[PDB]
Design a protein around this ligand. Structure first.
Ligand code: 9XV
Ligand code: CA
Length: 456
């Protein structure tokens, strides 16, 4: 009965999350800011019935913990679900860790005590995460004392995971083996935290591989080691906690509660022995984060380019039919009607919450441009891809940490492995872009490879 757009207005896009886009919204009466996840019913399948989802939402709204995201409201219309909750502005935990100069076991213990405190609380209330990963650890604010907030607790129980690689980047590292075969319980969150902790103290995933399926093979076997030089400077109690958290049989695996009482958490979170900086771990987390973000940006660039081609042609045909005399020009109200018609057929955009948002977007394009609708189409569609094109170059620049301007063949293999692009498929594309290749590409050659890898 209650309508989302009657209460909230979209201010700006915050980013892509599991199951949908996240928009910064504001209450039209009280002025309260909130983060809203818009889940498209067409793109996301429900695992449970409507009554099971409503009962979990009602429970989730009443729960409260300092390391769990607060949910405020829930709305549903014919095509979408709107999960309304608190905004966090500190960004992802790993993007903050790589910005600092020193990082020790004391810092890793403070991080993992918070995550475990949050998990322990949600497990007492019979809610499992299942998809716990570093990307779901947000920092409350930009300050250095910011608490960690776990996002998306309980959503995997009600919404089916996407099968598209652009949505699955980095999920294989943290997923518990029992989730892969179907019988799982809340212990799968201890395993995921165990993996996160292993990466905090070494900067390398315990179960790794050249592609998604090779990682899942390592996870399913469950075998890993502490045989990297960097593990020599780490305490034995940290290694003990990891062994208990990455125990294969879930009934033998330590609980979230007992992980808090472990010697490592008790010792390294108290204010009262020597603790050095894990320099090799920071460098490995910075290289790991750069790689994951470039693979993700490459996949989102290709996805936006295909979506842009579909919408450019659809919008061009809508305006062509609306052109009565055939002079190639239309009025403002016509362009609004046609642009609204694009969202009616292709589905409402997360940034275009209602007619007023569409009218403002049309006005923003008309400020750049009886008007030539082909010029309106070009500008409107280039504005939709702007964020994905700029995010690609920024991620290439961040990955190119030595500012050489190029990435090597070994780095391309790693990037395309995380992106799940077949080895022979990208090597074939490189040869068509630059026939006299020397085992390295610059940004334009890399973007040219991606354009070819999505039919251009
Ligand atoms: C993916 C990004 C990082 C953009 N994101 N995701 C979230 C989590 C979220 C946001 C709204 C609803 C739900 Cl169910 C989950 C969120 C939040 N709270 N505050 C700021 N940004 C957020
Ligand atoms: Ca370089």
């Amino acid at each position: 009965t209650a309508i989302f757009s009657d209460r909230y207005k979209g201010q700006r896009v915050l980013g892509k999350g599991s199951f949908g886009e996240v928009i910064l919204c504001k209450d039209k009466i009280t002025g309260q800011e909130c983060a809203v996840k818009v889940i498209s019913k067409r793109q996301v399948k429900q695992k449970t019935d409507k009554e099971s989802l409503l009962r979990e939402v009602q429970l989730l709204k009443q729960l409260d913990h300092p390391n769990i995201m607060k949910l405020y409201e829930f709305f549903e219309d014919k095509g979408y679900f709107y999960l309304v909750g608190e905004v966090y502005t500190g960004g992802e935990l790993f993007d903050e860790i790589i910005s600092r100069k020193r990082f020790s076991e004391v810092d890793a213990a403070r991080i993992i005590r918070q995550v475990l405190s949050g998990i322990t609380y949600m497990h007492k209330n019979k809610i499992v995460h299942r998809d716990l990963k570093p990307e779901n650890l947000l920092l409350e604010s930009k300050s250095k004392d910011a608490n960690i907030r776990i996002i998306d607790f309980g959503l995997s129980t009600h919404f089916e995971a996407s099968k598209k690689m652009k949505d699955k980047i980095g999920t294989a590292y943290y997923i518990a083996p029992e989730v892969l075969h179907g019988t799982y319980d809340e212990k799968c969150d201890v395993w995921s935290t165990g993996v996160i902790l292993y990466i905090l103290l070494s900067g390398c995933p315990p179960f790794n591989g050249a592609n998604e399926y090779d990682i899942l093979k390592k996870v399913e076997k469950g075998k890993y080691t502490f045989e990297l030089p960097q593990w020599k400077k780490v305490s034995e109690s940290a290694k003990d906690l990891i062994r208990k958290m990455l125990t294969y049989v879930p009934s033998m695996r330590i609980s979230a509660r007992d992980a808090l009482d472990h010697e490592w958490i008790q010792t390294y979170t108290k204010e009262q022995v020597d603790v050095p900086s894990l320099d090799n771990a920071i460098l490995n987390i910075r290289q790991f984060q750069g790689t994951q973000k470039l693979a993700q940006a490459a996949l989102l660039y290709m996805g936006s380019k295909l979506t842009s081609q579909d919408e450019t042609k659809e919008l061009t045909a809508i305006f062509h039919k609306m052109d009565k005399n055939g002079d190639g020009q239309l009025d403002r109200a016509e362009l609004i009607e046609g642009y609204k018609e694009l969202m009616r057929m292709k589905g409402q955009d997360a940034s275009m919450l209602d007619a007023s948002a569409v009218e403002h977007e049309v006005d923003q394009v008309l400020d750049a441009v009886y008007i030539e609708y082909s010029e309106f189409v070009t500008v409107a569609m280039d504005r939709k891809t702007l964020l994905s094109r700029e995010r690609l170059e920024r991620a290439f620049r961040m990955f190119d940490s030595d500012n050489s301007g190029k990435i090597s063949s070994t780095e391309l293999a790693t990037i395309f492995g995380v992106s799940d692009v077949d080895s022979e498929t990208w090597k074939s594309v490189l040869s068509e872009v630059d026939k006299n290749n020397d085992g390295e590409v610059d940004f334009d050659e890399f973007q040219q490879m991606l354009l070819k890898l999505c039919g251009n």
